Each structure stands twice: as C-alpha cells, then as structure tokens.
Amino acid sequence: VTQTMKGLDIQKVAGTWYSLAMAASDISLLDAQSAPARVYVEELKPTPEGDLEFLLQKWENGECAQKKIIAEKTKIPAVFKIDALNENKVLVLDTDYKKYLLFCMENSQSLACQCLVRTPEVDDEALEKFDKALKALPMHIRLSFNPTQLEEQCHI
Amino acid sequence: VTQTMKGLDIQKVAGTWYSLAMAASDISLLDAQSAPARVYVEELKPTPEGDLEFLLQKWENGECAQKKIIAEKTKIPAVFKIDALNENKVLVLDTDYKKYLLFCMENSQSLACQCLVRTPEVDDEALEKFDKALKALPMHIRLSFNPTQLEEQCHI
Numbered sequence: 001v002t003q004t005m006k007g008l009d010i011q012k013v014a015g016t017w018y019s020l021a022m023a024a025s026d027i028s029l030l031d032a033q034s035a036p037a038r039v040y041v042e043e044l045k046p047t048p049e050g051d052l053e054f055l056l057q058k059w060e061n062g063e064c065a066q067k068k069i070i071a072e073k074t075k076i077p078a079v080f081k082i083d084a085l086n087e088n089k090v091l092v093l094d095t096d097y098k099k100y101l102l103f104c105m106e107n108s109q110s111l112a113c114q115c116l117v118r119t120p121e122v123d124d125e126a127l128e129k130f131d132k133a134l135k136a137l138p139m140h141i142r143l144s145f146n147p148t149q150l151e152e153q154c155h156i
Numbered sequence: 157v158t159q160t161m162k163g164l165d166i167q168k169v170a171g172t173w174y175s176l177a178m179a180a181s182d183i184s185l186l187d188a189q190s191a192p193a194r195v196y197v198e199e200l201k202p203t204p205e206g207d208l209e210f211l212l213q214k215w216e217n218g219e220c221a222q223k224k225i226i227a228e229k230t231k232i233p234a235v236f237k238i239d240a241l242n243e244n245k246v247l248v249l250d251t252d253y254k255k256y257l258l259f260c261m262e263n264s265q266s267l268a269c270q271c272l273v274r275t276p277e278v279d280d281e282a283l284e285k286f287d288k289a290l291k292a293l294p295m296h297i298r299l300s301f302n303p304t305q306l307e308e309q310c311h312i
C-alpha cells in the first residue's frame with residue numbers, strides 16, 4: 001500500500017464509526033459472514049502514549065462477539081502494528097476527521113481495506129475516494145451496507 | 157435495468173465464455189460459493205428459432221455440478237425469459253461479440269450481472285464498461301477472478 005495521510009492527528013479520529021464498505025485481495029477474506037476480514041468497527045480509541053485501539057464485532061460461533069485490539073505506534077505517524085503470529089500493519093490512507101476515514105490491514109500476501117463513516121447513511125462522496133484509493137490495488141471482492149443494516153449487531 | 161444493446165445479433169454470441177466478474181443487489185446472492193447468483197458460464201447456445209441456452213456450473217452439495225437453462229425469446233431482441241416460480245428476465249446490455257458481453261438476471265427485487273470474456277485473461281477494458289453500466293444500479297457486492305481460477309471447475 002502506497003497511500004498514507006500526512007499530518008495525522010490521531011487524537012481527532014476517536015469516537016464512533018460505521019464500517020460502510022469493505023474490500024479484500026482475496027474473495028475468502030470477506031467471503032462468508034465468518035470470513036477473516038469481515039470485522040465490524042464500533043469505536044476508535046487512541047491511548048495517551050499514541051497507541052490506537054479498535055473496538056470491533058465478529059460473527060464467530062453462533063453469534064456476534066465483541067473484541068478489542070491494540071495497534072502499537074511507529075516512526076511514521078499513520079502506520080501501526082499488531083502483535084499476532086504475523087507482522088500485521090494498519091495504515092490510515094485518508095480522513096477528514098468528521099465524516100469518513102479510510103484504512104487498510106495488511107501482512108507478510110493478504111490485504112483488506114474499509115471506508116468508515118460517522119453516521120448510518122450512504123456518503124456517496126466517501127465511496128469515490130475509497131474507490132480511487134483501491135484502483136491502485138489488486139482487489140477481488142467488495143461489499144457495502146445500507147443504513148438499516150448499519151444499526152444492527154454484525155450488520156444483520 | 158435501463159440498458160440494452162441495439163441490433164443484437166444473437167447468432168454471433170454463441171460459443172465459449174468466461175465469467176470474469178459478477179455483481180448483485182444483495183450480498184447473499186454472491187455471498188458463499190453456494191449462493192443463488194454464484195453461477196459460472198461455460199457456453200452460450202442460441203437455437204434456430206432464436207431462443208438462448210446457457211451452459212453453467214454450480215456448487216450444489218459437495219461439488220461442482222453442470223446445468224442447462226433455456227431463456228425463451230421476446231419482442232425486444234435483447235430481453236429473454238426463463239420459466240421458474242418467478243418471472244426471470246435476462247438482459248444483454250452490451251457485447252462486441254468477440255471479446256466481452258455484459259448481462260443481468262432480474263426478477264419481480266433481486267438483480268445480478270456479469271462481465272463475460274472469451275479467454276482466461278483480465279480484460280481491463282471490459283471491466284470499465286461493466287463498471288459504467290452498474291453505477292446506474294443499486295449493487296452491494298462485486299467479485300472478479302484471476303486467470304488461474306478461470307481454468308478450474310467452479311473457479312477453484
């Protein structure tokens with residue numbers, strides 16, 4: 001991924017978000033409701049020391065679970081790192097802070113991204129920017145959700 | 157759907173095709189490998205009387221089945237009709253006859269479409285046209301396949 005935001009004021013991205021759209025390099029990453037990249041954002045929490053913490057929802061066994069994950073900071077302001085079996089990088093491509101924010105999760109050759117929004121509505125404008133950002137990238141599946149699904153656990 | 161091809165010479169669309177990309181109004185139509193719209197095109201056969209016949213592949217129980225379906229002709233050259241529990245319309249939006257062909261299956265509020273190609277390669281140009289044609293339409297999932305998957309039963 002070759003697109004980060006400059007002057008990333010991480011403190012300003014805290015609060016409430018909606019995973020409006022999702023996309024992945026491989027069909028099986030967003031494939032079924034249980035698929036590995038199919039993860040729903042509830043909340044972004046930065047820590048005082050500048051780490052970034054996710055609140056998420058996942059369909060796991062027979063239902064919608066809750067989760068926390070903490071992405072530790074780096075030298076480049078917009079790149080974070082999560083400790084799993086892999087080297088998992090999170091990158092903030094772009095955000096205007098108060099409507100939308102775009103980001104990608106990547107490893108290593110797998111890659112997923114998302115268009116986050118503040119309210120339960122279809123920001124047409126946000127979807128463009130998200131589309132522009134991806135045509136640089138080798139994606140093979142995309143999803144987006146309606147306002148009705150946006151107010152449910154795990155998106156219905 | 158508000159886009160058909162004019163002067164549709166149905167005889168010229170016979171032979172071999174590859175379901176390069178797919179898209180649907182609802183996530184669950186292309187969702188899992190078993191999903192209702194997830195149907196792979198092997199061959200288009202017109203009949204002498206101008207009916208249009210599909211050869212397809214579907215993942216059904218534990219494997220990739222074969223199928224035939226016959227879409228009967230109408231007054232408008234580019235619209236066909238299949239007899240199921242529903243009124244199922246097929247529409248040919250566009251084809252240059254020798255590289256790509258776009259079409260949509262619709263009922264009634266469900267809708268899926270596809271970009272068909274002649275060989276196992278990514279026609280970048282074909283994907284544009286397909287993208288143009290859909291932004292008129294309320295889609296919420298898209299897929300595309302690589303050349304490797306294109307030579308397998310049911311796309312791997």
Ligand SMILES: CN(C)CCCN1c2ccccc2Sc2ccc(Cl)cc21
Binds near residue numbers: 058105
């Ligand atoms: C335990 N899980 C639910 C979380 C890892 C899922 N997840 C993910 C998915 C597909 C490919 C790469 C990644 S890294 C990542 C980075 C940030 C976030 Cl928010 C999610 C992910």
Ligand SMILES: CN(C)CCCN1c2ccccc2Sc2ccc(Cl)cc21
Binds near residue numbers: 261268
């Ligand atoms: C028995 N099945 C495998 C065939 C029906 C599936 N199929 C379909 C899917 C989702 C929504 C509407 C339709 S009508 C249709 C028209 C032409 C073709 Cl080629 C396929 C379909």
